[PDB]
Amino acid sequence: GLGTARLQLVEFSAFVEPQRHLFVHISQLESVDVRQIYDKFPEKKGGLRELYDRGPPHAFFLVKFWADLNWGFYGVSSQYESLEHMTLTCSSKVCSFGKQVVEKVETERAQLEDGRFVYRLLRSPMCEYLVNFLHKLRQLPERYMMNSVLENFTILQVVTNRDTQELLLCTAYVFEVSTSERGAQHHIYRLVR
Numbered sequence: 001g002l003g004t005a006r007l008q009l010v011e012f013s014a015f016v017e018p019q020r021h022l023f024v025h026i027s028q029l030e031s032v033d034v035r036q037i038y039d040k041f042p043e044k045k046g047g048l049r050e051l052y053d054r055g056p057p058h059a060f061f062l063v064k065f066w067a068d069l070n071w072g073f074y075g076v077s078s079q080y081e082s083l084e085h086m087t088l089t090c091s092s093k094v095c096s097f098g099k100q101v102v103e104k105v106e107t108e109r110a111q112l113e114d115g116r117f118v119y120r121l122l123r124s125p126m127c128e129y130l131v132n133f134l135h136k137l138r139q140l141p142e143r144y145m146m147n148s149v150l151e152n153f154t155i156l157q158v159v160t161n162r163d164t165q166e167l168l169l170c171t172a173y174v175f176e177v178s179t180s181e182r183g184a185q186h187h188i189y190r191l192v193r
């Protein structure tokens with residue numbers, strides 16, 4: 001369960017269309033030390049270090065993906081939900097070799113549905129950098145080469161209460177490549193210290 005009392009992730013996927021092909025997908029708990037991965041994110045400000053210091057720790061998660069790169073419109077879809085009416089700020093930092101190369105900030109207001117509030121950020125066009133990176137990563141002859149390249153590639157997703165500036169969720173994404181026989185997969189972890 002990737003979430004807290006105030007906010008949970010319902011679904012998340014990154015895909016390409018001409019049906020959809022999902023490179024990664026979450027639809028709806030072990031632990032990992034944050035110390036392990038200060039290096040793969042920015043550090044001197046707004047880093048994983050600074051954010052985890054502020055807390056709360058229970059809002060910090062790690063997701064390892066094994067992506068399916070064997071298959072247009074390149075999109076990302078995400079959905080959150082909560083019991084409180086809120087307006088969310090969703091920040092996404094793509095990092096290469098610890099350095100931020102993309103920051104994407106989006107806003108989504110609560111939508112009342114079935115006795116709860118949903119937050120649907122759907123078919124958001126995948127940024128030009130990742131589309132370009134993806135088509136290159138595709139070219140590689142071996143999976144072990146893809147994994148070598150990917151071990152210096154991470155994403156940091158921060159979801160804050162726009163109105164109260166409070167952190168609701170912080171997710172760290174790291175990536176490997178799966179085979180065709182073994183579909184896309186994910187393993188969600190809890191960040192601790």
Ligand SMILES: O=C(CSc1nnc[nH]1)Nc1ccc([C@]23C[C@H]4C[C@H](C[C@H](C4)C2)C3)cc1
Nearest residue numbers: 014023024067076092104126127134155175
């Ligand atoms: O994390 C987010 C939030 S959305 C966004 N921010 N900028 C653009 N889009 N999206 C996300 C996630 C994962 C992937 C990728 C990364 C590797 C592995 C696999 C195939 C491709 C290469 C693409 C999954 C792209 C995007």
